[PDB]
């Protein structure tokens, strides 16, 4: 009953984690229990070509070693963790995640700008007052998202590489006394000319409620509320919902710029962005000015807010959608997400087996979902008859070499038939499981079709790990089906 989840970010200036507990009804809710963030510096890490450098793999497995530490001792177990730019953009990304996948046991798992803006849209989303017409500013280390939207979710996401640590990187700050200026006013150049063929998309209209979100957004709230005669927001409850002015902040702008970068980290409310603030704040003024904004509200909630809806709301719909299936996994304290994201595969590669050709009994599908549901249930190796849940146990647990060999005692041998339809499940099970082997959800079944006496198989919401996963869990499958070549 008292079910928590952990979802964590891998960002550019810092990684973040939430470990939530979810509420009941099938409702897409959860309260929060714990919140922790890492200063993993990560786009400080990069080489001259871009790579992530033995030290930031390091400061990636320790923040991953905390947050699966934290996450374990509220009662999650098992955290799914998304990264953006840093890790997106190092060409060594994908071995940096396998080697820190290794070493921690969590992936930290590469997903698009796109994809980015839009869980973060559900974070703001989950923090603030949204109206029918939005634009979020989501400024990071290494990039800032453009999102509009309404009620709900994202419409159109735009992510440019205008991030805190890149633009302060890309434009070197000088010796003289216009040195600050001269970096605002050249990061502000670059600002418009990435998004200038874009603006039109994220432009006032009447109406249009502004948003930022992220540590720069909040430090510049926080540092014009103590501006305004304002006491420092975290002595307070936070900044969420905060409003401030263009204005505002162009006046805060103009005093860091006549600092110098050491001056910077004593202006109140800025005191941990010293390094990277004057740059980021020309990034926030210039884009909103562009946008043609007047006013913005600061919201808390971000990516990893949005990561545990977007599982919420998969996880209880596909219950919905057997439904004492992913109950009675629970009852086995097995992880949900995964094990409901491993089902719908399932479902996904039955489907386009059948309408190909292959033959299948009826009840095979709902055999199917049950053992996918409970594959990792350690104690397990209902509208099921006592024959049907032996079929799906054995599913659940198919290996070459079984614990019981057929000579030995206890051994239980099925009819023939039932022999091959739990080896045909098996394989389709396999290949789900290699599918989320980086338990993101992200995965799905674009098309599978024939190729020759074999198979070839299209998926998305792929990452590195789940492709080479279908590499290591799909010999049954060829065995069963033939040659299965996977792409995208
Ligand atoms: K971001
Ligand atoms: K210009």
Redesign the pocket.
Known sequence: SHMRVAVADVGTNSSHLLIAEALPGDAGGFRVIDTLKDRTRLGECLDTRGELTPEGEERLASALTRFRELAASAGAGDVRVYATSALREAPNGAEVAERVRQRTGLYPAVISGVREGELTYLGVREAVELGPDNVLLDLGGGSLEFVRGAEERAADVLSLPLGAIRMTRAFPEGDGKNAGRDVADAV??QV??LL?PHAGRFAARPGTQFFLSSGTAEAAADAIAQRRGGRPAEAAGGVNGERFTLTELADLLAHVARLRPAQRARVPGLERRGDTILAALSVLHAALDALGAREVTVSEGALREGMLIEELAQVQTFSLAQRSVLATAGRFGVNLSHAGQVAELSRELFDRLLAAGETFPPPARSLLTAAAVLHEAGQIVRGFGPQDIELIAQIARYHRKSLPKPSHPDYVALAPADRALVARLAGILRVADGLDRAHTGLARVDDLRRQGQGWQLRVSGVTPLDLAGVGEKGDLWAREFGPLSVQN
């Open positions: 502000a150049r418009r000319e200038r």
